[PDB]
Design a protein around this ligand. Structure first.
Ligand SMILES: *[C@@]12=NC3=[C]C([C])=C([C])[C]=C3N([C][C]([O])[C]([O])[C]([O])[C]OP([O])([O])=O)C1=NC(=O)[N]C2=O
Length: 109
């Protein structure tokens, strides 16, 4: 298949911190678990990140809906790369959102 990464966000906490990331996620971005875990994924964002696309993710999280955007992210070394992101809400049986799962694909080609 195509190369991709994977993270899990804990919705039971208010700002959706990351609680597990795939080895590809650390290797793609250059950040380590000690600088990724516990934090919201937005640290990957930067000057060229489109605020309208960011808005689409922020609303989907509030609304508990899946979303797919294309964002300009930045590695730890500041170099940019294009990240196609799909966020999926994971619900408990009672309809409540417990976790958000994100597949990140570098589509810089
Ligand atoms: C990020 N991946 C990512 C993965 C999950 C599971 C979730 C829930 C969010 C992301 N984001 C977005 C970020 O965490 C945040 O939700 C948005 O920026 C909108 O909220 P704010 O308050 O900051 O406007 C991801 N953002 C990225 O830029 N790159 C990803 O890989």
């Amino acid at each position: 298949g195509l190369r991709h990464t994977f993270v899990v966000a804990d919705a039971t906490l208010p700002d959706c911190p990351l609680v597990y990331a795939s080895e590809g996620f650390y290797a793609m971005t250059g950040y380590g678990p000690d600088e990724v875990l516990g934090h919201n994924c937005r640290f990957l964002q930067g000057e060229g990140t489109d605020p309208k696309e960011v808005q689409k993710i922020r609303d989907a999280i509030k609304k508990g809906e899946a979303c797919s955007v294309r964002l300009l992210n930045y590695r730890k070394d500041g170099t940019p790369f294009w990240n196609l992101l799909t966020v999926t809400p994971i619900k408990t049986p009672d309809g409540r959102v417990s976790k958000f799962v994100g597949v990140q694909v570098d589509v810089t080609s």
